[PDB]
Scaffold this active site. Structure first.
Site, mmCIF file in Angstrom:
data_model
loop_
_atom_site.group_PDB
_atom_site.id
_atom_site.type_symbol
_atom_site.label_atom_id
_atom_site.label_comp_id
_atom_site.label_asym_id
_atom_site.label_seq_id
_atom_site.Cartn_x
_atom_site.Cartn_y
_atom_site.Cartn_z
ATOM 1 N N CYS A 53 0.794 -1.259 0.000
ATOM 2 C CA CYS A 53 0.000 0.000 0.000
ATOM 3 C C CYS A 53 0.808 1.280 0.000
ATOM 4 O O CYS A 53 1.571 1.611 0.921
ATOM 5 C CB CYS A 53 -1.017 0.033 1.161
ATOM 6 S SG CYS A 53 -2.157 1.423 1.196
ATOM 7 N N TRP B 176 -9.261 6.226 -0.729
ATOM 8 C CA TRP B 176 -9.621 6.987 -1.938
ATOM 9 C C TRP B 176 -8.677 6.665 -3.085
ATOM 10 O O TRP B 176 -7.627 6.120 -2.849
ATOM 11 C CB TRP B 176 -9.638 8.479 -1.692
ATOM 12 C CG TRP B 176 -8.422 8.994 -1.063
ATOM 13 C CD1 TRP B 176 -7.241 9.307 -1.681
ATOM 14 C CD2 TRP B 176 -8.255 9.282 0.294
ATOM 15 N NE1 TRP B 176 -6.350 9.802 -0.775
ATOM 16 C CE2 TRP B 176 -6.955 9.816 0.450
ATOM 17 C CE3 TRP B 176 -9.087 9.197 1.410
ATOM 18 C CZ2 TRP B 176 -6.459 10.205 1.680
ATOM 19 C CZ3 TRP B 176 -8.587 9.611 2.640
ATOM 20 C CH2 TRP B 176 -7.289 10.105 2.759
ATOM 21 N N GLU C 196 -4.956 3.931 -10.828
ATOM 22 C CA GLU C 196 -5.777 2.731 -10.684
ATOM 23 C C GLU C 196 -6.940 2.691 -11.688
ATOM 24 O O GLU C 196 -7.204 1.620 -12.291
ATOM 25 C CB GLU C 196 -6.352 2.702 -9.289
ATOM 26 C CG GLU C 196 -6.710 1.338 -8.857
ATOM 27 C CD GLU C 196 -5.465 0.542 -8.631
ATOM 28 O OE1 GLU C 196 -4.480 1.152 -8.136
ATOM 29 O OE2 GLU C 196 -5.446 -0.657 -8.986
HETATM 30 C C1 HEM Z 1 -5.736 6.807 1.381
HETATM 31 C C2 HEM Z 1 -6.260 5.974 0.471
HETATM 32 C C3 HEM Z 1 -5.407 4.835 -0.088
HETATM 33 C C4 HEM Z 1 -4.665 4.859 -1.202
HETATM 34 C C5 HEM Z 1 -4.486 6.037 -2.211
HETATM 35 C C6 HEM Z 1 -4.073 3.555 -1.338
HETATM 36 C C7 HEM Z 1 -3.254 3.158 -2.401
HETATM 37 C C8 HEM Z 1 -3.120 1.839 -2.714
HETATM 38 C C9 HEM Z 1 -2.894 1.285 -4.046
HETATM 39 C C10 HEM Z 1 -2.679 2.117 -5.341
HETATM 40 C C11 HEM Z 1 -2.820 -0.043 -3.941
HETATM 41 C C12 HEM Z 1 -2.517 -1.014 -5.113
HETATM 42 C C13 HEM Z 1 -3.746 -1.613 -5.777
HETATM 43 C C14 HEM Z 1 -3.352 -2.309 -7.056
HETATM 44 O O1 HEM Z 1 -2.745 -1.624 -7.915
HETATM 45 O O2 HEM Z 1 -3.631 -3.525 -7.281
HETATM 46 C C15 HEM Z 1 -3.040 -0.389 -2.550
HETATM 47 C C16 HEM Z 1 -3.027 -1.693 -2.073
HETATM 48 C C17 HEM Z 1 -3.451 -2.079 -0.800
HETATM 49 N N1 HEM Z 1 -3.877 -1.239 0.225
HETATM 50 FE FE1 HEM Z 1 -4.084 0.835 0.059
HETATM 51 N N2 HEM Z 1 -4.462 2.766 -0.227
HETATM 52 C C18 HEM Z 1 -5.306 3.543 0.559
HETATM 53 C C19 HEM Z 1 -5.956 3.174 1.752
HETATM 54 C C20 HEM Z 1 -5.950 1.896 2.297
HETATM 55 C C21 HEM Z 1 -6.663 1.443 3.471
HETATM 56 C C22 HEM Z 1 -7.641 2.267 4.355
HETATM 57 C C23 HEM Z 1 -6.303 0.185 3.692
HETATM 58 C C24 HEM Z 1 -6.858 -0.705 4.832
HETATM 59 C C25 HEM Z 1 -7.022 -0.291 6.109
HETATM 60 C C26 HEM Z 1 -5.418 -0.272 2.613
HETATM 61 C C27 HEM Z 1 -4.771 -1.510 2.492
HETATM 62 C C28 HEM Z 1 -4.244 -1.997 1.315
HETATM 63 C C29 HEM Z 1 -4.044 -3.415 1.008
HETATM 64 C C30 HEM Z 1 -4.291 -4.620 1.955
HETATM 65 C C31 HEM Z 1 -3.462 -3.476 -0.383
HETATM 66 C C32 HEM Z 1 -3.079 -4.771 -1.237
HETATM 67 C C33 HEM Z 1 -4.318 -5.344 -1.838
HETATM 68 C C34 HEM Z 1 -4.041 -6.671 -2.462
HETATM 69 O O3 HEM Z 1 -3.043 -7.369 -2.104
HETATM 70 O O4 HEM Z 1 -4.829 -7.003 -3.370
HETATM 71 N N3 HEM Z 1 -5.207 0.824 1.792
HETATM 72 N N4 HEM Z 1 -3.140 0.791 -1.773
HETATM 73 C C1 HW7 Z 2 -4.353 -12.505 -7.022
HETATM 74 C C2 HW7 Z 2 -4.424 -11.292 -6.138
HETATM 75 C C3 HW7 Z 2 -3.682 -11.187 -4.942
HETATM 76 C C4 HW7 Z 2 -3.772 -10.007 -4.191
HETATM 77 N N1 HW7 Z 2 -3.096 -9.878 -3.032
HETATM 78 N N2 HW7 Z 2 -4.583 -9.012 -4.583
HETATM 79 C C5 HW7 Z 2 -5.350 -9.122 -5.755
HETATM 80 C C6 HW7 Z 2 -6.279 -7.992 -6.191
HETATM 81 C C7 HW7 Z 2 -5.948 -7.264 -7.497
HETATM 82 C C8 HW7 Z 2 -4.604 -6.531 -7.595
HETATM 83 N N3 HW7 Z 2 -4.842 -5.681 -8.769
HETATM 84 C C9 HW7 Z 2 -6.252 -5.726 -9.202
HETATM 85 C C10 HW7 Z 2 -6.939 -6.178 -7.910
HETATM 86 O O1 HW7 Z 2 -6.831 -5.009 -7.044
HETATM 87 C C11 HW7 Z 2 -8.015 -4.465 -6.469
HETATM 88 C C12 HW7 Z 2 -7.684 -4.443 -4.983
HETATM 89 C C13 HW7 Z 2 -6.615 -3.409 -4.667
HETATM 90 C C14 HW7 Z 2 -7.202 -1.993 -4.633
HETATM 91 O O2 HW7 Z 2 -6.772 -1.368 -3.385
HETATM 92 C C15 HW7 Z 2 -6.962 -0.012 -3.180
HETATM 93 C C16 HW7 Z 2 -7.509 0.485 -2.001
HETATM 94 C C17 HW7 Z 2 -7.658 1.868 -1.854
HETATM 95 F F1 HW7 Z 2 -8.215 2.276 -0.693
HETATM 96 C C18 HW7 Z 2 -7.223 2.791 -2.848
HETATM 97 C C19 HW7 Z 2 -6.654 2.282 -4.019
HETATM 98 CL CL1 HW7 Z 2 -6.073 3.285 -5.431
HETATM 99 C C20 HW7 Z 2 -6.552 0.890 -4.167
HETATM 100 C C21 HW7 Z 2 -5.239 -10.240 -6.531
#
Ligand code: HEM
Ligand code: HW7
Ligand code: HEM
Ligand code: HW7
Ligand code: H4B
Ligand code: H4B
Ligand code: ZN
Lengths: 407, 411
Positions: B108, B280, B285
């Site tokens: 994140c 947000w 994204e």
């Molecule tokens: C301030 C707003 C936030 C921004 C701009 C942000 C930004 C991001 C972005 C760009 C990603 C990558 C998503 C992707 O490209 O696949 C991400 C992943 C992630 N964020 Fe944030 N984030 C924010 C808030 C949060 C909050 C509130 C949480 C939880 C309390 C969180 C937890 C995570 C987690 C667990 C991932 C990985 C998701 C996955 O493995 O699929 N984020 N963050």
């Molecule tokens: C196979 C797999 C593993 C993993 N850990 N996470 C995923 C989810 C995938 C990663 N890219 C597309 C999909 O992402 C959506 C979930 C991540 C979005 O998270 C956030 C949360 C926010 F609050 C803000 C933003 Cl810009 C992004 C897939």
């Protein structure tokens, strides 16, 4: 122990077995990943030699043949009395070709088998090195139709007699510190420029001053040499629609030629082994031109495009970055000097990867270096899982030699 | 054992001690780096140490480590575990836990915000309908008429793994995707399977390009139930370009609320399988991923056509040029409507300052470089040049398999 890589855009799954022959260490543990760290005796030498000749003889379809066993013997005896050995020519070519095949950071490996190898192992002086090098540069440049090549100087002996190219690339532009305290030319090369000046170089003190070679033969102190200007192919940079672009006075050189690496074949180390291919556009247009620490010209370009530089969210840096890279590509093409763009390079590597999986059981690949420094997720390498591991023969990075040489 | 990370742009060197508190495995070894692999019923026995580790963390952070209040709570949890097999978190602990799961989320980029997190405790929820109400409230509270606030809602923990709470939607708000008989796809191709499960579960599908999906909600191990989010609660932004007027006629829009609902929150050994959270958007994204991934809405061609770029050779960089404009458009649109959004330049920059702060105050900041670097313009954002160490701290968020792969249908 058998590992899968998935491409998440296509759903192609590949099975990697090649990793089990992995030998060197990655820097990662099951507790910490170091994926984005840039830098993570007779006794030891015989296994290494053996491991290599084994793969060589397997590659030539003669594993366990009379000729195979005979060579293992000869090398073994050479080590025991001489404490080292010499590669046959054919072995040297194969080692170098495979060092590039194994280079996990290199997106251009589809070409690994077309590598012209120049055997400079009979070299003895810096003058010899310069001569070999000028020949390398001219052969590789090929008036603009670029050919991949490596030149291999004599192997490390007892570490006190190393051949080294001091430059990091055969061709690079000088960097100089200025009165105001900013930087004229390429800031990457300040330290090296000053050494040159300090070795005696008459620096023209300009922005695109091709540097002199600093050559070290047989661990001697190094000497300077200018590359015949007519051998250094350079490209003036213009935009296909921005007339004012050319007024920036930008040029780049056509030949990328890494000269600071150490080549390891079958336990032997070739400490001076400069090699060259051809540019992917982004390496000049994104890194050389735009990096904060490099020529860093985004502000100047953005202004000429009259973009809104008041807020980061106008994406002015991004817009200017694209135009700069269109201009690099356009210029090289217009002058007929070989270049590739990130789209086609990455497409090419994906094909290469799939080839290496069916033909070899895998392909080491470092995703942090393979994915282009602009437009990542619209190239296919972005969605492709990769396994990174160290195979030998290899190229290794080595300490800038002035911290290591005694004077 | 100390580890240094370097920034190649600034030559700033940071020392990580924090990785010493890491426990889960990375997937990497000394022989193989797995840093780009997407995916690299508990027991009485393992639980009290996990509980204790967590509770020692909580109590140090409030400066009561070794307090009577600390030892009492240790013995209290101890007891609860042996007699009932599990334990219950206090409110104070739940909040702390959810904040640190975000703090430790190494992928994140948004973590500068980690201490601002509205925690909603939904641990009294017993039914799907009850889940819906709680989620609606989350969406209204987080949306806040465009002035997005970070929030998370936490449903009761896993027990025997047979009574799990799950949100089957991968984000609370997403568009449907429909596979046509001719192999084309209407709407989002990522969401096509899930949309089929909804149609099957009874949803009447409008069959257009931007249909908000219904929540599919699982309470207590029960079969999931369908619910429509109140459309007046779903803030959407129609996408237009500041200079190009043909852009709006592309017909594009996007929802303002990014809200992940498929992940698993782990705190002191407990497993919350339903903990939708929301922050947000970073503009890329939507701009890069949602619109321009080939496997998603795939609009690069259509945008380059309308821009009359030379499309006959990739070296015109027509893709790159079209990509920037779309991204300009997404940020323009959100901003004009006063819906919170961050660009990738400002988000990566905040993150490097977050990251350095964390090294000085915490002894580290784990970070996954492959995910942190934005999917466009990588090298002109300061994260590109930042060395990062990736390791797994608890509390943590975890991927969990889509539920339709594991649920035994009660029928
Ligand atoms: C301030 C707003 C936030 C921004 C701009 C942000 C930004 C991001 C972005 C760009 C990603 C990558 C998503 C992707 O490209 O696949 C991400 C992943 C992630 N964020 Fe944030 N984030 C924010 C808030 C949060 C909050 C509130 C949480 C939880 C309390 C969180 C937890 C995570 C987690 C667990 C991932 C990985 C998701 C996955 O493995 O699929 N984020 N963050
Ligand atoms: C196979 C797999 C593993 C993993 N850990 N996470 C995923 C989810 C995938 C990663 N890219 C597309 C999909 O992402 C959506 C979930 C991540 C979005 O998270 C956030 C949360 C926010 F609050 C803000 C933003 Cl810009 C992004 C897939
Ligand atoms: C044919 C055209 C070639 C292309 C398009 C190309 C592509 C690249 C690129 C884009 C990088 C990343 C460079 C950076 O960002 O610093 C790289 C690294 C590298 N390439 Fe190539 N390459 C080519 C030929 C060669 C050849 C002939 C060799 C050696 C025989 C080679 C060996 C390497 C090595 C060892 C690295 C990593 C360098 C380091 O770790 O500093 N490449 N390659
Ligand atoms: C500390 C350090 C380690 C390392 N392995 N390599 C370096 C050299 C840094 C890493 N990226 C920029 C700079 O390398 C430039 C030299 C590599 C260029 O490589 C090639 C070679 C080619 F034949 C073609 C192309 Cl496009 C690029 C530094
Ligand atoms: C910190 C990070 O490892 C470093 O900035 C890398 C990232 N990826 C790279 N990729 C390439 N091709 N070349 C580089 O020099 C770098 N630098
Ligand atoms: C295979 C590769 O690891 C995978 O495509 C990752 C790359 N980086 C990413 N980075 C973010 N932020 N989101 C992602 O979905 C991905 N995908
Ligand atoms: Zn790793």
């Amino acid at each position: 122990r058998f590992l899968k890589v998935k491409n998440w855009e296509t759903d192609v799954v590949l099975t990697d077995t090649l990793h089990l022959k992995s030998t060197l260490e990655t820097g990662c543990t099951e507790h910490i990943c170091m994926g984005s760290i840039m830098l993570p005796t007779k006794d030891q030498l015989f296994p290494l030699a053996k491991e290599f000749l084994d793969q060589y003889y397997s590659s030539i379809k003669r594993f366990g043949s009379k000729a195979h066993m005979d060579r293992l013997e000869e090398v073994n005896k050479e080590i025991e009395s001489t404490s080292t050995y010499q590669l046959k020519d054919t072995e040297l070519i194969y080692g170098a070709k495979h060092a590039w095949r194994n280079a996990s950071r290199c997106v251009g490996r589809i070409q690994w088998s077309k590598l012209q190898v120049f055997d400079a192992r009979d070299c003895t002086t810096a003058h010899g090195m310069f001569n070999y090098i000028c020949n390398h540069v001219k052969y590789a440049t090929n008036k603009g139709n670029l050919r991949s090549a490596i030149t291999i100087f004599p192997q490390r002996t007892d570490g006190k007699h190393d051949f080294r190219v001091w430059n990091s690339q055969l061709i690079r532009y000088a960097g100089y510190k200025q009165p105001d305290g900013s930087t004229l030319g390429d800031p990457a090369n300040v330290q090296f420029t000053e050494i040159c000046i300090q070795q005696g170089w008459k620096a023209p003190r300009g922005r695109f001053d091709v540097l002199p070679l600093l050559l070290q033969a047989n661990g001697n102190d190094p000497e300077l040499f200018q590359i015949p200007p007519e051998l250094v192919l350079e490209v003036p940079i213009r935009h296909p629609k921005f007339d004012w672009f050319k007024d920036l006075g930008l040029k780049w050189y056509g030949l990328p030629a890494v000269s600071n690496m150490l080549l390891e074949i079958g336990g032997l180390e070739f400490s001076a082994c400069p090699f060259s291919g051809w540019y992917m556009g982004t390496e000049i247009g994104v890194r050389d031109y735009c990096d904060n620490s490099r020529y860093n010209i985004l502000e100047e370009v953005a202004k000429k495009m009259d973009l809104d530089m008041r807020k980061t969210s106008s994406l002015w840096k991004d817009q200017a970055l694209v135009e700069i890279n269109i201009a690099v590509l356009y210029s090289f093409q217009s002058d007929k000097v070989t270049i590739v763009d990130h789209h086609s390079a990455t497409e090419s590597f994906i094909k290469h990867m799939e080839n290496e999986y069916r033909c070899r059981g895998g392909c080491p690949a470092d995703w942090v270096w393979i994915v282009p420094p602009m437009s990542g997720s619209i190239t296919p390498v972005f969605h492709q899982e990769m396994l990174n591991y160290r195979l030998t023969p290899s190229f290794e990075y080595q300490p800038d030699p002035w911290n290591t040489h005694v004077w």
